[PDB]
Amino acid sequence: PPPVRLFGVEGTYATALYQAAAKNSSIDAAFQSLQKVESTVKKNPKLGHLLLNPALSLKDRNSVIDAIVETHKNLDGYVVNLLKVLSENNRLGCFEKIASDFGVLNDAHNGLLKGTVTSAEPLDPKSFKRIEKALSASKLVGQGKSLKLENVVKPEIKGGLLVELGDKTVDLSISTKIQKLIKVLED
Amino acid sequence: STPITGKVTAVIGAIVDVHFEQSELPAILNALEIKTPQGKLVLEVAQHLGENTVRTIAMDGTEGLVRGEKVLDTGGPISVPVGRETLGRIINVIGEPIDERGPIKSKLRKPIHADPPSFAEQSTSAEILETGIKVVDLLAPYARGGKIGLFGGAGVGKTVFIQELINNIAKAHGGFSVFTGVGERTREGNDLYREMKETGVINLEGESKVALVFGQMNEPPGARARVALTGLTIAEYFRDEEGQDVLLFIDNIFRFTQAGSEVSALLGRIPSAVGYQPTLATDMGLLQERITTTKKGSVTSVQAVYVPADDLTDPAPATTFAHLDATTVLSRGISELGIYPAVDPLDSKSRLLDA
Amino acid sequence: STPITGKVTAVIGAIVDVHFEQSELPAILNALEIKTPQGKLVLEVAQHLGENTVRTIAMDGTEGLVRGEKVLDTGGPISVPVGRETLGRIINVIGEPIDERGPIKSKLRKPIHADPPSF
Amino acid sequence: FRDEEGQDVLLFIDNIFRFTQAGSEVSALLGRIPSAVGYQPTLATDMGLLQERITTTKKGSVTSVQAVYVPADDLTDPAPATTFAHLDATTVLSRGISELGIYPAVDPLDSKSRLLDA
Amino acid sequence: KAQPTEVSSILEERIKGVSDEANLNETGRVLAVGDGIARVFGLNNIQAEELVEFSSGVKGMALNLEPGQVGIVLFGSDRLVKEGELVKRTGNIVDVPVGPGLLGRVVDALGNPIDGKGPIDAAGRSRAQVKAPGILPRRSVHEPVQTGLKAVDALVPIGRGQRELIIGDRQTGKTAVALDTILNQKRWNNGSDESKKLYCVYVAVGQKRSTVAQLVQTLEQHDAMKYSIIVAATASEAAPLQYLAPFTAASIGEWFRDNGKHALIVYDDLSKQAVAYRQLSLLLRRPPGREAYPGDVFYLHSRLLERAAKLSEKEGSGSLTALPVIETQGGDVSAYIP
Amino acid sequence: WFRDNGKHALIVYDDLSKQAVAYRQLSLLLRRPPGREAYPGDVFYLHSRLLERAAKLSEKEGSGSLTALPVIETQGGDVSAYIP
Amino acid sequence: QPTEVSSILEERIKGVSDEANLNETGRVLAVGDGIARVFGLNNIQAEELVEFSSGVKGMALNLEPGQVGIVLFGSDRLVKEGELVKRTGNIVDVPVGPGLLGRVVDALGNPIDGKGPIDAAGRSRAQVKAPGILPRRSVHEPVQTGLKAVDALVPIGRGQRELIIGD
Amino acid sequence: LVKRTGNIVDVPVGPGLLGRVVDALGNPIDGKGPIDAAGRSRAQVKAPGILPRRSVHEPVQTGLKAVDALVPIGRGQRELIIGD
Ligand SMILES: Nc1ncnc2c1ncn2[C@@H]1O[C@H](COP(=O)(O)OP(=O)(O)O)[C@@H](O)[C@H]1O
Ligand SMILES: Nc1ncnc2c1ncn2[C@@H]1O[C@H](COP(=O)(O)OP(=O)(O)O)[C@@H](O)[C@H]1O
Ligand SMILES: [Mg+2]
Ligand SMILES: [Mg+2]
Numbered sequence A: 001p002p003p004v005r006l007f008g009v010e011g012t013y014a015t016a017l018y019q020a021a022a023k024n025s026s027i028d029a030a031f032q033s034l035q036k037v038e039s040t041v042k043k044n045p046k047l048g049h050l051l052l053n054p055a056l057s058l059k060d061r062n063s064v065i066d067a068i069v070e071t072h073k074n075l076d077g078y079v080v081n082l083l084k085v086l087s088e089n090n091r092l093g094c095f096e097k098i099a100s101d102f103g104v105l106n107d108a109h110n111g112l113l114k115g116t117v118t119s120a121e122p123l124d125p126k127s128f129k130r131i132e133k134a135l136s137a138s139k140l141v142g143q144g145k146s147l148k149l150e151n152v153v154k155p156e157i158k159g160g161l162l163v164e165l166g167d168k169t170v171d172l173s174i175s176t177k178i179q180k181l182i183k184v185l186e187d
Numbered sequence B: 001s002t003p004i005t006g007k008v009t010a011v012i013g014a015i016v017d018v019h020f021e022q023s024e025l026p027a028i029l030n031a032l033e034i035k036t037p038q039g040k041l042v043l044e045v046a047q048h049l050g051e052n053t054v055r056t057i058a059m060d061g062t063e064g065l066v067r068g069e070k071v072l073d074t075g076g077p078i079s080v081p082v083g084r085e086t087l088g089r090i091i092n093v094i095g096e097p098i099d100e101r102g103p104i105k106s107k108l109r110k111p112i113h114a115d116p117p118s119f120a121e122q123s124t125s126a127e128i129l130e131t132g133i134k135v136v137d138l139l140a141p142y143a144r145g146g147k148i149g150l151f152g153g154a155g156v157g158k159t160v161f162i163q164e165l166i167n168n169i170a171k172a173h174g175g176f177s178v179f180t181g182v183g184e185r186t187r188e189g190n191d192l193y194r195e196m197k198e199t200g201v202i203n204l205e206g207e208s209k210v211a212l213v214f215g216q217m218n219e220p221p222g223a224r225a226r227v228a229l230t231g232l233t234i235a236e237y238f239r240d241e242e243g244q245d246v247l248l249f250i251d252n253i254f255r256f257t258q259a260g261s262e263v264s265a266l267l268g269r270i271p272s273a274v275g276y277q278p279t280l281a282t283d284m285g286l287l288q289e290r291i292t293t294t295k296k297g298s299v300t301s302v303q304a305v306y307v308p309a310d311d312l313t314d315p316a317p318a319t320t321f322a323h324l325d326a327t328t329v330l331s332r333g334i335s336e337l338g339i340y341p342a343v344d345p346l347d348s349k350s351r352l353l354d355a
Numbered sequence C: 001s002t003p004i005t006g007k008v009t010a011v012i013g014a015i016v017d018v019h020f021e022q023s024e025l026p027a028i029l030n031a032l033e034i035k036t037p038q039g040k041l042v043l044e045v046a047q048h049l050g051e052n053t054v055r056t057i058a059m060d061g062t063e064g065l066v067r068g069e070k071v072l073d074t075g076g077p078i079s080v081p082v083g084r085e086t087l088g089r090i091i092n093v094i095g096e097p098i099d100e101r102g103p104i105k106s107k108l109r110k111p112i113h114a115d116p117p118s119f
Numbered sequence D: 001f002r003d004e005e006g007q008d009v010l011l012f013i014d015n016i017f018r019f020t021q022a023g024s025e026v027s028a029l030l031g032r033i034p035s036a037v038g039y040q041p042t043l044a045t046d047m048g049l050l051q052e053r054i055t056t057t058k059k060g061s062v063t064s065v066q067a068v069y070v071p072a073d074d075l076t077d078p079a080p081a082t083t084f085a086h087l088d089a090t091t092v093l094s095r096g097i098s099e100l101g102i103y104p105a106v107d108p109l110d111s112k113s114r115l116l117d118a
Numbered sequence E: 001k002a003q004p005t006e007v008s009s010i011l012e013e014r015i016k017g018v019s020d021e022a023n024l025n026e027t028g029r030v031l032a033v034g035d036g037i038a039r040v041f042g043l044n045n046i047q048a049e050e051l052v053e054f055s056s057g058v059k060g061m062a063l064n065l066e067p068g069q070v071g072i073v074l075f076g077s078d079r080l081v082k083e084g085e086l087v088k089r090t091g092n093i094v095d096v097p098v099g100p101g102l103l104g105r106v107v108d109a110l111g112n113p114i115d116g117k118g119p120i121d122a123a124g125r126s127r128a129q130v131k132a133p134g135i136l137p138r139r140s141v142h143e144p145v146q147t148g149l150k151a152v153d154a155l156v157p158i159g160r161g162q163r164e165l166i167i168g169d170r171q172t173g174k175t176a177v178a179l180d181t182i183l184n185q186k187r188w189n190n191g192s193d194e195s196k197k198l199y200c201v202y203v204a205v206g207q208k209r210s211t212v213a214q215l216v217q218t219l220e221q222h223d224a225m226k227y228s229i230i231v232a233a234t235a236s237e238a239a240p241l242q243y244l245a246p247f248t249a250a251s252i253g254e255w256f257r258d259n260g261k262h263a264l265i266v267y268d269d270l271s272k273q274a275v276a277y278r279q280l281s282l283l284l285r286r287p288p289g290r291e292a293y294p295g296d297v298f299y300l301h302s303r304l305l306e307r308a309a310k311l312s313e314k315e316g317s318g319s320l321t322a323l324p325v326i327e328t329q330g331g332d333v334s335a336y337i338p
Numbered sequence F: 001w002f003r004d005n006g007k008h009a010l011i012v013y014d015d016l017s018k019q020a021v022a023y024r025q026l027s028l029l030l031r032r033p034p035g036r037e038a039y040p041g042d043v044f045y046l047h048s049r050l051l052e053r054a055a056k057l058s059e060k061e062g063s064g065s066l067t068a069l070p071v072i073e074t075q076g077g078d079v080s081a082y083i084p
Numbered sequence G: 001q002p003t004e005v006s007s008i009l010e011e012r013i014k015g016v017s018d019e020a021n022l023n024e025t026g027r028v029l030a031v032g033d034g035i036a037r038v039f040g041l042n043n044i045q046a047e048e049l050v051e052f053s054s055g056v057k058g059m060a061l062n063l064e065p066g067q068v069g070i071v072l073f074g075s076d077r078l079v080k081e082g083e084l085v086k087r088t089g090n091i092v093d094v095p096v097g098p099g100l101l102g103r104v105v106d107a108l109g110n111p112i113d114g115k116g117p118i119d120a121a122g123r124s125r126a127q128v129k130a131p132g133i134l135p136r137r138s139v140h141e142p143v144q145t146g147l148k149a150v151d152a153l154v155p156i157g158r159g160q161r162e163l164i165i166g167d
Numbered sequence H: 001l002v003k004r005t006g007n008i009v010d011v012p013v014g015p016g017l018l019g020r021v022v023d024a025l026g027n028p029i030d031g032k033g034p035i036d037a038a039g040r041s042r043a044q045v046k047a048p049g050i051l052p053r054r055s056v057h058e059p060v061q062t063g064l065k066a067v068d069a070l071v072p073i074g075r076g077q078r079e080l081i082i083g084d
Helices: A009-024 A027-043 A045-052 A058-070 A079-089 A092-109 A125-137 A174-185 B134-138 B158-172 B186-199 B221-240 B253-266 B280-290 B315-323 B332-337 D017-029 D043-052 D078-085 E002-010 E174-184 E209-221 E239-258 E270-282 E297-305 F016-029 F044-051 G148-152
Strands: A112-119 A146-153 A162-165 B005-012 B015-020 B032-034 B041-050 B053-058 B070-073 B080-082 B108-110 B147-152 B177-180 B210-212 B246-250 B299-306 C005-012 C015-019 C031-036 C039-050 C053-058 C070-073 C079-082 C108-111 E027-033 E037-042 E050-053 E059-061 E070-075 E086-093 E095-097 E125-127 E199-205 E229-233 E263-266 E320-322 F008-011 F065-068 F071-073 G025-032 G035-040 G048-052 G057-062 G068-072 G084-091 G093-096 G122-125 G164-166 H010-013 H039-042
Touching (some): A009 A027, A009 A079, A009 A092, A027 A045, A027 A058, A027 E002, A045 A092, A058 A079, A058 A092, A058 E002, A125 A146, A146 A162, B015 B032, B015 B041, B053 B221, B108 B221, B147 B158, B147 B315, B158 B177, B158 B246, B158 B299, B186 B210, B221 B253, B221 B280, B221 B299, B253 B280, B253 B315, B253 F044, B280 B315, B280 E209, B299 B315, D017 D043, D017 D078, D043 D078, D043 F016, E070 E239, E095 E239, E125 E239, E174 E199, E174 E209, E174 E263, E199 E209, E199 E270, E209 E229, E239 E270, E239 E297, E239 E320, F016 F071
Parallel strands (some): B147 B299, B177 B210, B177 B246, E199 E229, E263 E320, F071 G164
Antiparallel strands (some): A112 A162, B005 B015, B005 B070, B032 B041, B041 B053, B041 E027, B080 B108, C005 C015, C005 C070, C015 C053, C031 C070, C039 C053, C079 C108, E027 E037, E027 E086, E037 E070, E050 E059, E050 E086, E095 E125, G048 G084, G093 G122, H010 H039
16 A cells, blocks of 8 residues: 555556555665656756647657656666656656655655644744654654654744644644634624 | 558547557548458548547448557548449449449549538529429429429438439430439338339440439448538539539438437537537538539539428428528328329429519 | 736636736635736636636636736725715726726725625 | 245335436436436436346246336336336326326326236 | 766757747647647747637637647638647737728638639728727717618617617528618618718628528629628638627728728627537537526627627717627527527 | 348337437446437447348349338337437 | 646556556456446457456447446446456357247347257357348338238338337 | 534534524524524434334414315425425
8 A cells, every 4th residue: 555645647657656666665766766857857947848748749758758768877667667658648747746746655654744834934943943843752643753844934824833744733823813712702 | 652550549439549640640531541351441530639649430330440450541531433434333432332343443533521612603593404293393493503402201202203303304414413322221222223223324334324322321420421422522523524514412411410410429529509410500511512503514402301290490401491492392291192292382482483 | 015926827718717826826706907908907716726726707808818927916806996086987897987087086995895794 | 025935925116216216316426427318327227127126937926016206297207218118007197187186196098007908 | 967968959859849949939739629629739928819820721719728728719621720730820819801992892700802803902900809889989879770671660770870689580581681771771872971871791600602692692683782791601611700700790890980981780690600609619618508508608799799889979970780680499589699 | 140041031129219228328338428318429320230231132142031120119209309 | 837737537547567468358447337447458349249257248339548448248246346358359149040930039149938058050240231232122022910000001011121119 | 724623514403592593504693692502413414214203193283274274284294385
């Protein structure tokens, strides 16, 4: 069973790649290959437009694949097979997404759970460290995994935090609390 | 030049999907010939599905369709034999004669679909056609180059009336004629050919004057839908190059529009125009507009309209009622009395019936 | 306030799809003005398709609309000028006076989708 | 009861049209393309096995007594129309006789049975 | 480091130049052509309902502008347009020529002559779909125009600028009364006073060339063809042509209306215009509405019939008169489009 | 088989509407594009291919005959439906 | 949107990128309501008989590129997802001959009367094309149905397709 | 953020709802004060079975002096009221 559930054709290839890498125990190699491919895509903005093109033909898609493969001389023994499968399935316009879900699968198993400590103002780094240790020591999705909380400065929050971690957010924001008294005040 | 070829990817009943290479994608209404063990099968494109794939309709029985077979394009629509040699021979929508009497060595070969004559070429017909039938010669005279409609239901005698028209016109006029058998029954077809042989209009060892474009209903719906335009192509080739008055005979225009809606049902073709076919207006006008009295010659289109239990509410009979100029309705009640021609004297009106 | 802006992604006849950024998505029944050569066009939101895209309905013809066109968010429903200055003046759905009598000198603009009173 | 016990079974199935209605119910959410007037595409087949499982065998007999609720009193509706052909004895309770005063309402014409023999 | 440079250099080829020297902003590649529809990716600078060339001879209009593909309605037969063909936008919204040159000539949805007598010398070019005259620059319909037919002249008089509807069944003689008005305009169109003159324009949306030809012939027999402009989008022509032809005639009539002259537009058989737009919408992934018609057919008809109006004396007192017909079946005008 | 062997055969196509309904179910389950009254596309082609087989052969083919007697069930006497 | 989403659906749900020789074999991706979807069977023909591992026969009507649509000759209980499927190498046929007379047979030719096996002079294809236009003769031998009305006013002849349409 | 309440959809039920107007969710909308409910019942509740159900024998006094009296309603009937 893959670490997390993925849905849609943009993600089915990601979980298929993760299952294939599990058989060979080469998840790290596939991950690094995907990062190298997306870095190459970011290196050439035109190449990113080439990937997203749905009208680009089978020979042209294959040529794009040989272009992205000849550099580094091979990304991985299986990710090139996934790329050619995408070519014969016409799915080069989603490779960034497939890399995204493969990365999500990677942090799902490698103990790299991510959190979003969103606040109205940028989080003070002394207060940032206090948030990390408490949630790391807590049992919220805790089975020996690290944590990667990152501050998300948004205007929707009036103030405070929404500690988000694995389908768990605490309604500790002062904005939601002051509103929650309003409806009962208007009884 | 290298032949343009591809591989079949899908076959859904009479609909076959073929994949082509780069710059190898043909145009719509083309011919996709696939070498089949049971003779020769060709497919006609209807719409592009993207990813170098074309959605086509089988022009012949879809038995033995396998994905990956090599299908070669003919460079356009499947050219049908056109010329004097086609007279006296039954020709299908695929150009392969079903009379086992040798291939038709026609003068030329024209595609089924062609641009209709321009607006300037359109003109009205005001010439009397001698049909040899007293009631329709007097009360509802035919028009030389016009569009005639032979209304009537079942058991009323439409097809026999058409073949009698061809026989009488050939006897009384040397101009060639063509009879497209859209939705034509095989037993009725054998009857038609036996009558043509026995009447002298079709001479196997000599010169004939009528060519059959029989539809053979048991072929896939595309053949039934396109035999009408095949016969129309024969008629326009006879009119233009030969420069003679020709007699186009539609077996059943109702069956033609039914087959058009049918092939619409196989494909996406979301019905919007009339309800059962969204394209019906487009191809219907493309067909009817092509019969026109051009400066080269005149084509008289005698179409038979079948009304099931007087289904005038349906737009299909009304559409045919809009095209024609003189009607020859063959109500069954008259034939039940003893007058087997069954044409109603008061309901068979003629546009050119004036002093 | 941050300069909320969007990019046109689809024009479904009258319907126009605009892609916004994270937290920049306006709610539904929210005017979205687009600068056009034939005047001023605004669009109210009715459906949130997702992926930072909101389906909108135009208050006028969408002639000449291009993908990537900048869409400015008013901040709330379609504000229309209000007051005694609007009396005897032809004012359209958007709020621009179409009586060819000059601009409306109204000091307030109450949103059309105001909160209805309670039972 | 018919096979093992070998007894004449008086099966009284009440509102058998609800079986086809539930088939159409599940069919809409099963991804099946709706059939004519919105019924399930597999109505004919599934009701075929259901009804053909009722028959008179050598072991015994099942005298199934079914009542069919015709939608809108429209006998051309696919489910009652096919139940007509998939059934021996028919007793149509027309509303036009039910409100006429003869509430038994058995329409004396479409109520036909195969036992009508000399 | 050298290999990334080499691969970047060689990526320019083997990609059919879809991104290089094209930019996919004014050009594009067709994914697939359907039933008068060609889905093309690119055209990042495309405009709404703007004309586009397919590099084959047929024109097109981007009525729909989906993010993944630009839904373009084919302006002609779909045979000559193929998937993967390079398209080029015209840079302008769909526009048709307007002027006095169209008098005594035939045109189509794209404003080109079909009979081929000669080139059209129309003095100006206006957009096919323009905004209706404003609420202020208009006046009450007061100039009377005689119809010829007593049943409408003495009972339901049509005014100069009124969008009166002559609605009937399949066979009711709507074209008969239309031609009656056309031939009754001959009394003033052969005079000198422009106020009484009425340059009538007739639409032939979806009508086959035989019927349109017979109508043009019987119009010529009355010597009334000179002052009448005839536009035709035949049944053999594609549905987009049928959809545009009334807008073409709207622009034609608006040219006379804004020039101080009086023009008459007769929107013959707008029912098949409605069904053609319904076909275009249903084929363009538009959500179906009532009777499968899209909800914007009312939008289309309002936009089309508000063009014909009586302007104030400020705009030269020119008026455009609308006389559509609806070919209902069975006399049931209770349907959504009627 | 009887027709090609010189013998005379009579085939009765009882309840062709049932065959049409079965083909409709098969096509709808197969996600084929539905047509009029939700019936499948190649249904008229099906009926033609089934019925045109029965005929009277020529003398050179053994003079066999296959007589077709199709039977359909109308819905309330409506002969204007697709299958009728 | 710098990276728009334009994908819709693909019949491939398991990325293998290896394995071959599935031209004659296949695996059932989805099966239900008497129909099945099988990936593989590259060299299969249109409505060609196909044999399942459970013994239930099938017919290949839908042949989309992703998978071949198989309609089952019976209930779908015995067939499950991923089961191996094999081609029969031939189209559906039916035993024919003079021994069919006096027997009741299944649609596939199996004798359901239960009075022994079936003896047929040969086997003929189920989907046989109609006889050609030329090898036909005018219907002249009458078929005596026995009822006065049909025999008199609407007579039926040998080789004539006469529809008995009724409520 | 979409927090879940942890329970099936419920509505206040009890004798305190007498004289009070509430919405679908059961919140007081008439503005007469809070709703005093004995408990909370699921909006979707399975209907009583055959044995828990009883034959309708207790009359319901419609008070219409019409057919509603000669053919009654009774306690427990779901008597429909159709019409335009
Ligand atoms: N004028 C006629 N003289 C002799 N027989 C006729 C005449 N008209 C019709 N029939 C007979 O009636 C039958 C009608 O067949 P056909 O015309 O093919 O079908 P429909 O009447 O439905 O058009 C023919 O088999 C023919 O023998
Ligand atoms: N006022 C009229 N007087 C005489 N004949 C008429 C009149 N109106 C219509 N017709 C007849 O109607 C026919 C044409 O009908 P048409 O105008 O095409 O109907 P519609 O306008 O509904 O399409 C002509 O043959 C003509 O004889
Ligand atoms: Mg006939
Ligand atoms: Mg008319």
